[PDB]
């Protein structure tokens, strides 16, 4: 499957793509404002994620640091990124269908649209100014808006027992972005697409 990753932000981002225990395609690349990077994701990829990283520095070997979404200091991500990270999430070719969503469960750094480029389903979007409106206690000094689990490490926010409810913090993310997961047991906003669809992830879709 092809994923065109497009940076419409006025600032550089470093795109990342991983399934947690491996890179997807090259795993990461710099995207200046306006740049597009097309990756190939193997059919059947389960639990894949694409995200943006901000304010990165990498040496000539591709080692360094990002202020949001850092993946063990690598340009080419092999693992998931450090919150806060707005997440485009996907599982492909799962019994004949693809499943896509956006999640704020690991916080928010960059607005995103995640849409099919092929027929048969709708896209999802979280493009509100979550960083600007972020509750004081969730603001990440490094940049972005942390989820409450990251900040407070409680069973309730992290849904450790599988018994959690919505919270004042989750409701903030849900209010700003109804179409993204705000906590682990949120009413799903997952979209079912035809198996083997192709996609575009656009950072800063509205600005």
**Exp. method:** X-ray
Residue ranges of domains in the chain, CATH in brackets? 1-207 (2.60.110.10)
The two three-digit tokens of residue 75, written as one number: 């340009």
Could you say which DSSP state residue 188 is in? Answer: P
How far apart CA 155 and CA 151 sit, in angstroms, is 12
Dihedral class, residue 158 (left if φ above 0, else alpha if ψ from -120 to 50, else beta): alpha
Within 13 Å and on the Cβ side, how many CA atoms surround 137?
A: 9
- From 33, 134, 34, 46, select the one nearest 86 (Cα to Cα): 134
Give me the residues paired with residue 5 across strands.
37, 201
> Longest Cα pair distance anywhere in the chain, in angstroms?
46
Phi and psi at residue 70, to the nearest 5°: -55, 130
């Amino acid at each position: 499957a092809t994923f065109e990753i497009v940076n419409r932000c006025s600032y550089t981002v470093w795109a990342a793509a991983s399934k947690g225990d491996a890179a997807l395609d090259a795993g990461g690349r710099q995207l200046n404002s306006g740049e597009s990077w097309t990756i190939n994701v193997e059919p059947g990829t389960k639990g894949g994620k694409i995200w943006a990283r901000t304010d990165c520095y990498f040496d000539d070997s591709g080692s360094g640091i990002c202020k949001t979404g850092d993946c063990g200091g690598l340009l080419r991500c092999k693992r998931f990124g450090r919150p806060p990270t707005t997440l485009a999430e996907f599982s492909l070719n799962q019994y004949g269908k693809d499943y896509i969503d956006i999640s704020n469960i690991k916080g928010f750094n960059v607005p995103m649209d995640f849409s099919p480029t092929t027929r048969g389903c709708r896209g999802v979007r979280c493009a509100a100014d979550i960083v600007g409106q972020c509750p004081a206690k969730l603001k990440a000094p490094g940049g972005g808006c942390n989820d409450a689990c990251t900040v407070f490490q409680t069973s309730e926010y992290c849904c450790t027992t599988g018994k959690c409810g919505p919270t004042e913090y989750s409701r903030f993310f849900k209010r700003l972005c109804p179409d993204a997961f705000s906590y682990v047991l949120d009413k799903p906003t997952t979209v079912t697409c035809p198996g083997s669809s192709n996609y575009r992830v656009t950072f800063c879709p509205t600005a």
